[model samples]
Target: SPPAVPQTFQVAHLHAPTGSGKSTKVPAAYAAQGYKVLVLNPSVAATLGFGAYMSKAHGIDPNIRTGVRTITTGAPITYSTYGKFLADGGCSGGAYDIIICDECHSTDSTTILGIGTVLDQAETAGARLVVLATATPPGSVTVPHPNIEEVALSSTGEIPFYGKAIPIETIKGGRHLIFCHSKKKCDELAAKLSGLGLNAVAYYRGLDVSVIPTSGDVIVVATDALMTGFTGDFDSVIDCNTCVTQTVDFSLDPTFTIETTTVPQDAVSRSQRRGRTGRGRMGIYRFVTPGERPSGMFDSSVLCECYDAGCAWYELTPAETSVRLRAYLNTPGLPVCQDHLEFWESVFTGLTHIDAHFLSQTKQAGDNFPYLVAYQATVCARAQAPPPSWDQMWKCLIRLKPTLHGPTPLLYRLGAVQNEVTTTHPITKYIMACMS
Candidate 1:
């Protein structure tokens, strides 16, 4: 016989499908087992449904809390939105026997820091159980603890809730919900659809609810705001924006190089967007299939990828670059010339997104420092102007130095009229040679 596993693990990743009863049955069961459970939902919009799930499905009325208001009553189960939890700094394990993170995959820029902070605190507070319940968890990312376990619901012999992608033109006539990338895109698409005599209305955050027409063959065009939390019963779901790609660009000056890496749309976010449909019935999920390209294929990605290439072609001369550089340095509240302390503070803020381990592993202000000083010298070379003094640049560069272990000095005598370059990278050498 195999070894008997424990009844409950320290951290259980409830990797279950949508409507698989993560909110309804799981929390109630834990509460029945005498665990003071606290479920943290992704958004304020989700808190009401989550609390209702606890009451309607199971005979438990959980304490519902959101950023708008707080419930003071004590209950076995407490439901609160992540927004309130983040606003209040964080919660400790001592407050609850089990902490369940509903829709744990919502690691957007706004919530990433809060999630990281809670995980750090959870360990220190000795959290008994942390359950990350979601249909689509983070991809290739590990949580802090090692003893965590994954619990996958059986899908064998079960009918799939969602239908495969179909063309938008094939839709016959039913209430459809279309998700756009932005609020403006929602209004534009809705307007275009309405122009064709279809009953389409735009719905986005902060928009009045009365604008949504509750009539026959109506179409609701909305942003990703409607995709994640709120539940709706629509016959079809359409995503106007869908292409997913990750690109890496390498600038080999000898030859400019670009490598495009295309990741699939199977990211948690893309999956969540598509999962908005197919609740009780097999809902139509219409989207543009990859390779079968169309006019609305891209808008932002193309512009961002090509903008730098366009600028690189029209290289800025020394005098022209210095004019722009001087104008930039002269901006109010920015670090002025010879203010190494202020410059250090400014640069540190700019680099706050970068973590310590990454800084230690990579070159210490290596490439970027050369670029900065190279531009500074060009400022001097341009009219022999005082040029934001090399001493200030060198000192600030040293202050921004990452603790990389090596003979890290690549640019020797940085303030010297002519800097000595040690590294043999073609571009770095060329830039250093042209410094004087």
Candidate 2:
């Protein structure tokens, strides 16, 4: 049976799974019913091919507009980019019978805000606005229409292997798109794969698409540039070290060092990457060396400490913040930001050591430690006593390293008298007094 849609014009969201024919089937079905269709895509590249598909398959040549050029606008079917719509001030929505914003989840800020105007036009002009997506972010699409309809569609096929970190060598035979963090990484991996006797190409933005091989047994090593608006006939996707962990220097405190790791691309992006396959065949998706963290914890609600603290501060206690964290972590295949091991470690340490300070404060804490320390330093300067040393201040505020020492002031204004004030004229003395 065909999925039921509103007979009369009404705004709706088609929350369909990736690789489901929401892109090709939905539009064709609507267009065949004699509705004037206007499809808004995220890229100029998409408008070209999708417009052609509409022309050939559905027998409706679309009036195509993109960043590159604008063809003559005559047909009821039209395909345009979000960039062009936003650039044209988004005033071109009233005439269409159905305005479909494809991949609505990945649009830029201005396009999201401009949707209000599109909704406005749809309302007054009696047109149907359809926002389509496979995965959605919180508050990404909030329509104000009272009659707005949402239809969530799910896939019944076997779920892809999304949780494991398989060895790179295990990928034996399939058309695969390997995603990397940097263009440099993509170039390196493409070469490495070619050495393994596989046909590989390093693809990025602004490069001609003709470079990609359209035949059997091909590997396209790419950065996040391939994540949006691009589709291909691939059977597997390898997320190879895309979530990188690297050490960073804390400049003010050279003795202390910390490591920060990039979280996995959110579930939405991974879904799109996984969606590259499974259009016509069964697909596989895996992370190569994704560290020991669970892949299913990428949601902002689980990742943000401020969100947890804010909940605690607001005193809304239906389920405690920790309880929510447990629920989400246990839920199968849901992505979260932080690792579960580190989270439990922090909890254990906090419980054991009440005296130990938590230097990191959420915004809801209502304390400014830096300002307070600066104020205290100013007091010491006015009293003409030994102001707090760098060691003294940093030890209280941050973890101490035994190799570090000296009497450098913690804050800028806390600097004591030095060789520059040797002459000691009255004006100089006054300035020195102020500086001290």
Candidate 3:
């Protein structure tokens, strides 16, 4: 049966076992329905990882095809920064008609804000939006927007599994096991464990080998530092410690057993080490001071903390939003006048429906220009020449007809008018020239 059309979109918990084809299937399903999609992966690493997967599956450069844009540091679209999405008018002229926020549980406030802005722009342009997160719990605070449709997929339900699980069982030896929250903690624990007949080794980020013990011998197997390009053979995991915080805990299979411990901090490196234990059959275990506990025994509610802290979207006050907009426009390298400033202020406030006071205040203390000169400057720098005529622009807009929802001609004319004013107007050119 076809998926039901939802009236108001929702954010719901989704659970899928490892190797489930969620990555390949979900996006394609939406894309096939003629939705121009925006897919957000949590980290640059995951972005690249998923990009590779989709590229191979779809036989197109997924980077371009699915619009797999990133907001990583030093990138063109850093989530930490705003203005680009707005300036580009929803990612360079309404490029994405639908958005899929992958690993939505891990999204930081900045990312959520950025994605929300883009989605709002797409929505205003009459587009569909979809956000995907794995293993999100119910009653979590990071609920989907009231307007978005929500769908849940679980392994126990109609959703079919894509990958098979191979289990590995290991018996514990007299050697002591150690798990720590940070590299320093791991080192400390490893030293203590080593004192008690166990060959303890600390695994941190960027470590190239998986330290394994075999028949009284410590073996080092070449491994990817962060499991990148890791095609080595492995099955099952022995989670030695209780670093199973947040999304990690929910994603774990319930059958495995591992000891739990308290550590100073829960860092990314510590989490990756837990998965090393389940790599091979008959995996050996040296139960740390805390004895092994059954998987899923821990309180699931604790997982919500990650979502609350990580995924909480900020509701900027009308004043604060205004201040930010002004700052972006007037920053020394990027100065603006009142008119263009107000235009952006209006654009953001109108598009987001955010309060005007939340928009940034103008700080044009010295010079008095009616329009936001800096905004006009920046836009001119980025803008391409408008279509030779309005009709040409209409043709370009018509090509986007499949994804657009409402009357195409009106939207096309709106875009053409905006484009001509920003791109072809002599006054805009003069302002950009002055800034240059």
Candidate 4:
């Protein structure tokens, strides 16, 4: 028979629609496997919601429950802040056996570093680790690390974008919603558009400009702030001008529609908004006005230009592109697939290799460096060995010592057993000989 497939510990990426039971199903499965669990969530709202759900399901007070610890950065650890628990060496004291990182895609360097530390401690303590995240970008840099095993689930279709634009024709003199980055710019644009025969009014915060649409001409230029609280029936949305710097939630308005121009920075937000337009026919327009386009307005094209420059810069060197292509082709599921290997190999073959110190100097400052270490300790006499049926490991972890500094003597005894088992055979015999 073929050699039994080695047990793989790859991280699985589950991509399901919003209502899918991922929040509960994933955590419960690991919990049942006799592992302690820690959940790192990106947003405060999400953390609270998941905590409440898990609490109710387990029949414990979500707030005071010791079995399942929930950690938020600013929240009290007695309340469960993960950073505090990890930094205090709680896991090293045999506190938790598993970790579930939610919203893992948003993990920055610091978050990754903290997680690495916790996992390292857990591994030394003989624990398991699990992680979960969404596909939204900027994706987490930590996910693609060599140490992690990644499992991905891609649905038949793409995840909908966050922001969208809907077009509306002015009913000659009807109310219209116009969006702009600044109130002054909105006023100027409204005047320019109105001079062309469309009736126009500028809407600003604390300033009311109401123009009821009639059969001839009407336009309204509204600052983003004014549109925040004012919601009323409008004929349609005219030219909307905004950048990607701000996040706007248009789903709150049942009657809201938008007309978004293609701005490189706003692409992701626009796509997310596009998903919000209820089941209705929608349209988007892309066009260039008379003047020259503004700088940085076309980042996609700019990136292409950078790639070309990078290729030209490398072409003068004596490196063989074939070697690089072979190396890249060996790695599966990478963003640059085998098909693009030859192309990129030729493009980057001549890139200079800098020393480690030079590379370190070029690295971004303020980056959080995540590291991992493992700790082992024995259980207290009162502590119960994990049962076979325990599925959620984190729940058990929550029951371990509350702080690393306060481990009982019995726990230290357990640590001794782990140390004996893990030490090299020669070292173990020497220690035993010394005892004799």
After superposition, candidate 1 runs with Cα above 4 Å error: 1-9, 139-172, 227-231, 243-266, 291-436
Error of 3 at 253 (Å): 44
Error of 4 at 134 (Å): 2.1
Candidates' lDDT values, in order? 0.47, 0.48, 0.33, 0.34
Q: What digit string (tens of lDDT, one per residue) describes model 2 on residues 305-423? A: 22223232222122333343443344332233343333322322222111213223312233322222333333333333233454344334233324323343322222222312112
Compared with the true structure, what per-residue lDDT tens digits does model 4 show for residues 1-436?
1011123333334444432255455555555554445555433444556666666675433332222443433211112334344334435554454455444332232233333344344445544443443434232121122222222222222211113322223224554445555667776766766675667777765774334333334556664432332334344443332342311122211211122233432332232222222123332222112122222122221221222222322231223323332332232221221133333333233223322332232222211110000001112112223211212311232344344332222111110122112222232233233323
- Give one digit per residue, the lDDT tens place, for model 3 in 1-436: 2132244443222344332254556656656666555555445555556556665776534542213453232211112122223223334454554555544333232343344454444444544444443433221222222222222222332211112111111212322223333456455545544564444455556564435443343312221135444332222222233442321121111111122334322222223343344343333322122223222122322221112212112344333344433432232211122323332233223222211221211112211110121222222222333222333312322333344332111101111233222233443333233333
| Candidate 1 lDDT over residue span 1-436, tens digit each | 1111234435556666543477667877777767777778767767777776666677667888787878655787888876566556566547776777776554331233233334445544555676767765434222111221222212331211113333344333778777665567677777767776677888876776677655568778876555333346677666543433423222323211223333334344344555555666666555533222211112222222222111221232333322333332332321122312232222222221222332332223342233334433332332223332335444433433343222222322232332322344333444344332
Q: What TM-score, computed on C-alpha atoms, does each candidate reach?
A: 0.52, 0.49, 0.41, 0.34
Show the lowest summed lDDT stretch of 10 residues, model 4. Answer: 367-376
Q: Which candidate would rank higher by TM-score, 1 or 4?
A: 1
Better of 2 and 3 by TM-score: 2
The deviation in Å at residue 141 for candidate 3 is 17
Candidate 2 root-mean-square deviation in Å = 16.6
The residue pairs in collision within model 2 are 296-334, 296-335, 296-336, 297-335, 297-336, 297-337, 298-335, 298-336
**Which parts of model 2 are misplaced by more than 4 Å?**
1-10, 18-35, 124-175, 191-200, 216-218, 227-231, 241-261, 278-283, 289-436
What is the RMSD, in Å, between candidate 1 and the native fold over all Cα?
17.2
**Poorest stretch of ten by lDDT in candidate 2:** 144-153
Model 3 residue 152 lDDT? 23
Higher-TM-score candidate of 1 and 2: 1
